[PDB]
Amino acid sequence: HMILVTGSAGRVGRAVVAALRTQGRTVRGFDLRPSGTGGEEVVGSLEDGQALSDAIMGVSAVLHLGAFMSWAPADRDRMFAVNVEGTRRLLDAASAAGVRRFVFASSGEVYPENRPEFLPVTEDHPLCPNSPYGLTKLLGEELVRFHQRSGAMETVILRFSHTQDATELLDEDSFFSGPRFFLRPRIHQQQNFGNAAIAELLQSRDIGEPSHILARNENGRPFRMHITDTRDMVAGILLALDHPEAAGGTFNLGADEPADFAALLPKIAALTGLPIVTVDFPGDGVYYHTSNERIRNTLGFEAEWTMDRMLEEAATARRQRLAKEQRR
Amino acid sequence: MILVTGSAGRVGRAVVAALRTQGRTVRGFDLRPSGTGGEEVVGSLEDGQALSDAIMGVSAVLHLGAFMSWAPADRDRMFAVNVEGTRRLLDAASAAGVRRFVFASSGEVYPENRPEFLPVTEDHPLCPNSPYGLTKLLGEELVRFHQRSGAMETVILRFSHTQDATELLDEDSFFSGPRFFLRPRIHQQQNFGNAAIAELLQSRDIGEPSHILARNENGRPFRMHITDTRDMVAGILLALDHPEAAGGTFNLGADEPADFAALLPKIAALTGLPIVTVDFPGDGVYYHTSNERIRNTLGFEAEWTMDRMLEEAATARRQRL
Ligand SMILES: NC(=O)c1ccc[n+]([C@@H]2O[C@H](COP(=O)([O-])OP(=O)(O)OC[C@H]3O[C@@H](n4cnc5c(N)ncnc54)[C@H](O)[C@@H]3O)[C@@H](O)[C@H]2O)c1
Numbered sequence: 351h352m353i354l355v356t357g358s359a360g361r362v363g364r365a366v367v368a369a370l371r372t373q374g375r376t377v378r379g380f381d382l383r384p385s386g387t388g389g390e391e392v393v394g395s396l397e398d399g400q401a402l403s404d405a406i407m408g409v410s411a412v413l414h415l416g417a418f419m420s421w422a423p424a425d426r427d428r429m430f431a432v433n434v435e436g437t438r439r440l441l442d443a444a445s446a447a448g449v450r451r452f453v454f455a456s457s458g459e460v461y462p463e464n465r466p467e468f469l470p471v472t473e474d475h476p477l478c479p480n481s482p483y484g485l486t487k488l489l490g491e492e493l494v495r496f497h498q499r500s501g502a503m504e505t506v507i508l509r510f511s512h513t514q515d516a517t518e519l520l521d522e523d524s525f526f527s528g529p530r531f532f533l534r535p536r537i538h539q540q541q542n543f544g545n546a547a548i549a550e551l552l553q554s555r556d557i558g559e560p561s562h563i564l565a566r567n568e569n570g571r572p573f574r575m576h577i578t579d580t581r582d583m584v585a586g587i588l589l590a591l592d593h594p595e596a597a598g599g600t601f602n603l604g605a606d607e608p609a610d611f612a613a614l615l616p617k618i619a620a621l622t623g624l625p626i627v628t629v630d631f632p633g634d635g636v637y638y639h640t641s642n643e644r645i646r647n648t649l650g651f652e653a654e655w656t657m658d659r660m661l662e663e664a665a666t667a668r669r670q671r672l673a674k675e676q677r678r
Numbered sequence: 679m680i681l682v683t684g685s686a687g688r689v690g691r692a693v694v695a696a697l698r699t700q701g702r703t704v705r706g707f708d709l710r711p712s713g714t715g716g717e718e719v720v721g722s723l724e725d726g727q728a729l730s731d732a733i734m735g736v737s738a739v740l741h742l743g744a745f746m747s748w749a750p751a752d753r754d755r756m757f758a759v760n761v762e763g764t765r766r767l768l769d770a771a772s773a774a775g776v777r778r779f780v781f782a783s784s785g786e787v788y789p790e791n792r793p794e795f796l797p798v799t800e801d802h803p804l805c806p807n808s809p810y811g812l813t814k815l816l817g818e819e820l821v822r823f824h825q826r827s828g829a830m831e832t833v834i835l836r837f838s839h840t841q842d843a844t845e846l847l848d849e850d851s852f853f854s855g856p857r858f859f860l861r862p863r864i865h866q867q868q869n870f871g872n873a874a875i876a877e878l879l880q881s882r883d884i885g886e887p888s889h890i891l892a893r894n895e896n897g898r899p900f901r902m903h904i905t906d907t908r909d910m911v912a913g914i915l916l917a918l919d920h921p922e923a924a925g926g927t928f929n930l931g932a933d934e935p936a937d938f939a940a941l942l943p944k945i946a947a948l949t950g951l952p953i954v955t956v957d958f959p960g961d962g963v964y965y966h967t968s969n970e971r972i973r974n975t976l977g978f979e980a981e982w983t984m985d986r987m988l989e990e991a992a993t994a995r996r997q998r999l
Pocket residue numbers: 356357358359360361362363380381382383394395396397414415416417418419432455456457458510511512513514
């Protein structure tokens with residue numbers, strides 16, 4: 351046996367590789383960057399046929415987590431090249447090599463979660479993406495479904511929750527959680543995205559010291575979304591790899607309940623000591639519940655990392671960081 | 679200015695001809711010249727430069743250009759032309775302020791060759807089983823993304839298999855030759871590398887040229903829609919012009935499929951050739967596709983019955999002979 355994990359230098363991919371190696375399993379990574387773990391890995395691109403053939407040699411299962419995201423139109427061609435064409439060729443190569451199971455990392459942006467037709471969002475919700483990234487994942491799902499119906503290779507489609515390492519949650523410098531929960535990092539993120547109207551609104555709400563942000567929509571409805579610990583995503587991915595009943599399946603993978611920002615921000619602020627600034631953003635905002643009932647019932651998935659557990663760990667990490675910075 | 683991609687192909691050249699006869703302003707776009715001398719870009723959907731030149735000053739796009747191949751060596755190109763080319767053309771059209779974009783899709787998106795229910799309606803699941811069918815499904819999703827997101831109107835037309843009337847009784851035509859004549863079908867299957875099917879067909883040869891009546895392994899005659907190019911052109915004009923086509927998805931083709939057990943004797947009555955009946959391994963082809971939506975929404979009326987098509991095909995055959 352040999353398991354190929356693409357995107358093995360990324361958040362989830364590295365954790366999946368690590369888990370498999372603690373099991374003593376033979377794993378090969380495949381990522382544009384080295385992982386820095388010094389494990390067996392191809393350092394190369396999903397765009398390159400040579401890298402694909404090298405990566406697939408002798409492989410019995412593929413966990414396809416490698417993908418590219420960008421908001422810049424300059425990068426859109428690359429996003430389709432990596433996410434659509436790369437997935438297409440990797441699927442064909444895996445099938446030709448007699449791979450037994452191919453697990454595809456999809457996203458709730460295929461629905462999209464940011465514009466649900468009903469709640470909770472189940473796997474049979476329409477697939478009507480409104481972002482180019484969501485569109486690439488939908489096209490990827492269709493490539494996977496084509497193989498599911500036509501070859502001996504088993505497939506699993508997993509629609510990922512937004513995923514964080516617990517320690518990222520209370521780190522101003524984290525890529526997602528910094529702007530998600532801290533006002534000044536969000537000002538900076540929005541400026542760098544070039545969203546001037548939002549950036550200026552955020553700056554206008556600054557209270558003269560660092561603060562948390564509690565994001566709500568134009569009607570003052572607090573944001574709500576699934577934030578899932580990397581460790582639970584890993585557990586579900588391992589189930590997708592090994593469980594008999596995963597074959598041919600499509601599953602939302604994420605924690606049971608969304609974080610309600612109205613409840614969550616006070617809990618966060620109780621841990622950091624920072625004041626909270628509430629901002630009403632234009633539009634519907636982010637407000638979704640995504641059902642993980644199918645994966646719970648079909649594969650026996652159970653998430654263990656509740657937001658309360660994640661926050662406790664995030665806080666410990668933050669305090670260690672601040673102790674070091676302040677020489678305490 | 680109407681841009682028609684695939685303008686040197688079967689349906690595209692006819693659409694361009696129809697629009698030009700009406701006195702409309704049309705620009706072609708195809709890998710090949712049309713041979714008509716009309717305004718056209720000779721170039722590729724894979725070429726960003728060619729896309730830029732083709733889209734300039736354009737107000738509507740009829741996107742009929744695409745590549746089909748059964749060979750694995752050709753699969754990368756099929757995806758590059760049908761998926762990536764469509765993606766970039768859509769983006770170019772949208773940015774240029776194109777008012778309506780009509781996309782030529784296929785019954786292969788369903789697929790018609792393995793229906794879940796009959797007749798096949800637009801809400802039939804989309805589960806293609808050929809790489810070509812897959813490229814058209816992905817193209818449809820690209821169009822749907824634009825339909826939902828931009829001001830550019832879209833129309834998706836799922837095409838019936840389409841023939842010029844004259845092709846039907848021509849042994850040398852690409853589709854109808856093998857479809858209805860035994861020896862051309864042997865040659866086709868040989869050139870595809872389907873050596874064992876070619877051998878079955880060869881074993882049925884009666885020592886002179888013959889028609890083939892294709893059935894499945896249980897002797898169920900094949901049944902499929904074969905629509906005249908002229909009816910497809912009529913439907914495409916409606917997709918271009920009709921206010922109610924906007925945001926629509928329509929099966930485009932004639933009302934009824936041809937059942938080959940009925941069709942082949944009609945064909946043989948016109949050519950004089952004997953008929954050889956072949957029972958192919960597997961489920962064969964058997965489908966009815968509903969055009970009710972386009973009939974009732976756009977006022978589409980198919981006019982070229984198979985009998986009319988065959989009369990024209992026979993006349994053309996007789997002139998050739
Ligand atoms: N983390 C999330 O919140 C989240 C949510 C929904 C979906 N997803 C999807 O789940 C998967 C993994 O999530 P993640 O957080 O670990 O993503 P990540 O961005 O942290 O990791 C992605 C990895 O893919 C690699 N990659 C990019 N282009 C490549 C190429 N051409 N060839 C080889 N590798 C390439 C990157 O180098 C990167 O290491 C991705 O497909 C992602 O799109 C993630």
